Amino acid sequence: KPVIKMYQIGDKPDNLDELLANANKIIEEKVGAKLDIQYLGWGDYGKKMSVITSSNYDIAFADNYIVNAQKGAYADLTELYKKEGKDLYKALDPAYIKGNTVNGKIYAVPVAANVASSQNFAFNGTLLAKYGIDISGVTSYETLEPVLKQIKEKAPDVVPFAIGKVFIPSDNFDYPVANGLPFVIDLEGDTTKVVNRYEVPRFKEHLKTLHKFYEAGYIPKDVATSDTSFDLQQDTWFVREETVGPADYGNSLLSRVANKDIQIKPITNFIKKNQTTQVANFVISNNSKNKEKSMEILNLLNTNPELLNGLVYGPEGKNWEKIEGKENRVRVLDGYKGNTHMGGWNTGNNWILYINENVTDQQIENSKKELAEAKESPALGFIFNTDNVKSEISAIANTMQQFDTAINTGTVDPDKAIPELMEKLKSEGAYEKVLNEMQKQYDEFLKN
Ligand SMILES: CC(=O)N[C@@H]1[C@@H](O)[C@H](O[C@@H]2O[C@H](CO)[C@@H](O)[C@H](O)[C@@H]2O)[C@@H](CO)O[C@H]1O
Ligand SMILES: [Br-]
């Protein structure tokens, strides 16, 4: 009975022992293995894993998937999916296959959740109710400014907009590769061309908007170095940006974890793309000596309702109880409020998850409506080939790192800093080389 070492992003729940104890009860019974989760934290998960990958594990939360897949850091899963992961493979929307297949080979166990999703303003309804601030005209950042002014007056001690050092203005863009290049596909523009986000006149606008937010104090002054969370349960923040999807049932899940009414406002379109498919992938180590077992566990994580909810909702009777009368329905208790559970988006199949009392019958109907009506990005399945430009990438992803954080967070004036970035980029030659190559492959992708 071997021990399976799984690396996970984020902070560990306080009841982790209890969480694995009841989990292993089922896992051992059906697999004969013992899962061990080591959380690695948030802020520097990218670097902390890079050490492990460079320097032995079994399962891991995938950091920069597409890149580390072409290098051979991830084990092949095509044959495992034909046996130990046959069940979970059947429950997967084909778009997950489109997005996580590199060189006719898949290395990921994508968590079946929001395969399509939009970026949203999540509002604190406790602060919305108390001051009656009108969020009816908010369709962008530009329209979010007036609403930030009000909360700054009525509640000076609350952070209006709560963002961090990872913040980039969200738009209707498509990243064939990022991290960490400024190359997008403008889904509101020429869908055939690959462009620079800083040359898109409306994204430059978001930057102006966010610099005004900085100057006005709607944004934490130390935002360029701030990597801190704002627990949704706490009224430290007024509004934040979130990825919201069908497996969340609108603001049902948001209002649940926050233990208060959370209102949401779309700022991007609802679409199926690589980014949405690769948002939460699980991989198995190249050097993993329990590969066949690792898939047998990622299977149980995505196919067993009891096992999954025992981690996502937490212990039964403490954090939740079942609703007698209606099947597949539960209600969270007092035990749920706090670090006593995991997140569903990065643990397993969001569909075998029980549904909480606060989800309306219209919220389930809308999760069926959004699902079926979900449109696909023309670049979905477009995995960029880096064989020719592996080092021309790191030249650009270096010039960016020297400037992008201060810019994307609005700390500096885009009118002065954006030309600095461009000139240093265009002076190189790796810019035009990767730009052309990217356009060249994308042409062949739409040519077919
Ligand atoms: C509230 C909740 O559980 N929401 C999840 C989203 O977080 C998730 O989006 C991701 O969120 C993480 C951390 O905030 C971030 O690192 C990712 O870039 C991504 O934005 C979403 C994914 O479909 O699923 C929701 O349920
Ligand atoms: Br534009």
Residue numbers in the entry: 40 to 94, 97 to 489
Reported in the publication:
Here we characterize SpGH92 (TIGR4 locus tag SP_2145) as an α-mannosidase that trims the terminal α-(1,2)-linked mannose residues on high-mannose glycans to generate a substrate for EndoD. We also identify a solute binding protein (SBP; NgtS) from an ABC transporter (ABCNG) that binds soluble N-glycans and, through X-ray crystallography, reveal the molecular basis of its interaction with these branched glycans. The identification of an ABC transporter that possesses an SBP, NgtS, that is specific to the recognition of N-glycan fragments suggests that this is likely the convergence point of the complex and high mannose N-glycan processing sides of the N-glycan degradation pathway, with this transporter functioning to import soluble N-glycan fragments into the bacterium.
NgtS also bound to Man1GlcNAc; however, the low affinity and limited quantities of the sugar precluded binding analysis by ITC. Instead, we employed a UV difference binding analysis by taking advantage of a perturbation in the UV absorbance of the protein upon sugar binding. An overlay of the structures in complex with the two ligands showed that, within positional error of the structures, the location of Man1GlcNAc is the same as the corresponding Man1GlcNAc portion of Man5GlcNAc. The recognition of this disaccharide motif is completed by the indole ring Trp386, which sits over the glycosidic bond and oriented parallel to the co-planar arrangement of the Man and GlcNAc pyranose rings such that the aromatic ring of Trp386 packs against the α-face of GlcNAc and the β-face of Man.
